[PDB]
Amino acid sequence: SPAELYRAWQDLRAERPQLRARDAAALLQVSEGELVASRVGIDAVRLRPDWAALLPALGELGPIMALTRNEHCVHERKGPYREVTVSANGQMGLVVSPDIDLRLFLGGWNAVFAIAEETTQRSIQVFDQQGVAVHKVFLAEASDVRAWEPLVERLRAAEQDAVLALHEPRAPAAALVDAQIDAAALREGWAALKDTHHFHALLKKHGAQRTQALRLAGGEWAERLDNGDLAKLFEAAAESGLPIMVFVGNAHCIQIHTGPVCNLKWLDDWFNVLDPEFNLHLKTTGIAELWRVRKPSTDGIVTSWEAFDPDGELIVQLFGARKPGEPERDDWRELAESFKAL
């Protein structure tokens, strides 16, 4: 299998070099993680899933680029991989800094590979239990390359294992129809929210999908916007120099940009941010619904825009820049509210 897979990939690549690994893997009926596994003993080394050792260690690489994405949006942020914190039970990770800013949900993180692609482009690539990408970090020119080999050697997995073991995904708990939701209680809970953290518990408490909750919250809490307006918001934020927060993630990893955005560009269906330390690539046609959301909190009402795909998963979220213990800034609040609801 691994040999044929790697060869089937290269043949596909020769005919269609635009195809990236993720794309190639789909065409070859395998996960990206299995595709990467087939590179082991060619240009990849499998590493131990030792998150508590691995994560702090990436700091020795100096300035890198961190890439986190979902199906429709890719978030690339440059900076040193610091400061890393991993929880007691090793299931939760944090990277906190003005540049690399990450929330890591380690329990689903399955395999990790170090890739030295000759082209030599070096990267650490992490895959989940279904072999879907979680998070990647690429070395740049500014990276300290002398750190690479010792890091790799220290983390080398005992078994090269060029196959990788994949689990079946846990069943999606029953989706309730809108009428089966206690809307009033949902609303009461919404108003009582103290930490934007406690929102997830609220959805679970009422068994509501995230978009479903938005639908039932009511307009003072959540209103649907024209899908096109998200790009216009970036453009409007760019013209003002308003410092914002852009959240992009998947089931296992959330990546954050905090600061202004400058250069915005369209390219077919792609809307992009193209700044020196931050690139964002959003496939706008993946956007099924867009919402302005307002959540009470001990720091005050917090306003955000939330974009979702047709399966109801989050694609990207925008907030105003603020430290913890601070209220959101009126400039952001103004802008976020300035667009007319459907």
DSSP output for 279-338 = EEEEEGGG--EEEEEEE--TT--EEEEEEE-TTS-EEEEEEE---TT-PPPHHHHHHHHS
Which residues are annotated as part of the binding site for heme b?
Answer: 103, 196-197, 210, 295, 322
Phi first, then psi: what are they for 163, rounded to 5°? -125, -45
**Residue 170: Cβ within 10 Å count:** 7
Nearest C-alpha neighbor of 9 from the set 24, 31, 29, 30: 24
Sign of CA dihedral 316, 331, 273, 99: negative
Three-state SS at 127: strand
Both structure tokens of 293: 């959301």
Q: Cα–Cα distance between 304 and 320 in angstroms, integer?
A: 8
Asked whether 123 and 112 are in contact (CB, 8 A), the reply is no
Both structure tokens of 48: 């131990």
Q: What is the identity of the amino acid at 160?
A: Q
Both structure tokens of 316: 């990207």
DSSP 53-103: HHHHHGGGG-EEEEEEE-SSEEEEEEEE---EEE-TTS-EEEE-SSS--EE
Beta bridge partners of 40: 44
Q: Which approach determined this entry? A: X-ray
Task: Give residues preceding each break in the chain, C–N over 2.5 A.
Answer: 119
**Cβ density class 153-166: b for 16+ within 10 Å, e for less:** eebebeeeebebeb
| Angle at CA of residue 233, ends 229 and 235, nearest 5° | 115
- Strand order of the β-sheet with 121-128 is 44-47, 109-117, 121-128, 133-139, 63-69, 73-80, 278-283, 270-275, 264-267
Strands 92-95, 84-86: pairing is antiparallel
Both structure tokens of 155: 């983390």
Q: Cα–Cα distance between 151 and 61 in angstroms, integer?
A: 9
Q: Cα–Cα distance between 331 and 317 in angstroms, integer?
A: 17
Please name each of the domains of the chain with its CATH number. Answer: 1-81+111-174+262-282 (3.40.1570.10), 82-110+175-261+283-342 (3.40.1570.10)
| Angle at CA of residue 334, ends 330 and 336, nearest 5° | 115
Phi first, then psi: what are they for 122, rounded to 5°? -105, 145
Which residues are annotated as part of the binding site?
Answer: 103, 196-197, 210, 295, 322
Which residue in this structure is represented by tokens 């009428």?
Answer: 179
Q: Cα–Cα distance between 258 and 100 in angstroms, integer?
A: 9
Q: What is the identity of the amino acid at 273?
A: V
Give the DSSP H or E segment for 116. strand 109-117
Strands 63-69, 133-139: pairing is antiparallel
Q: Cα–Cα distance between 318 and 194 in angstroms, integer?
A: 20
Q: Cis before residue 34, ω within 30 degrees of 0?
A: no
**Residue 150: Cβ within 10 Å count:** 11
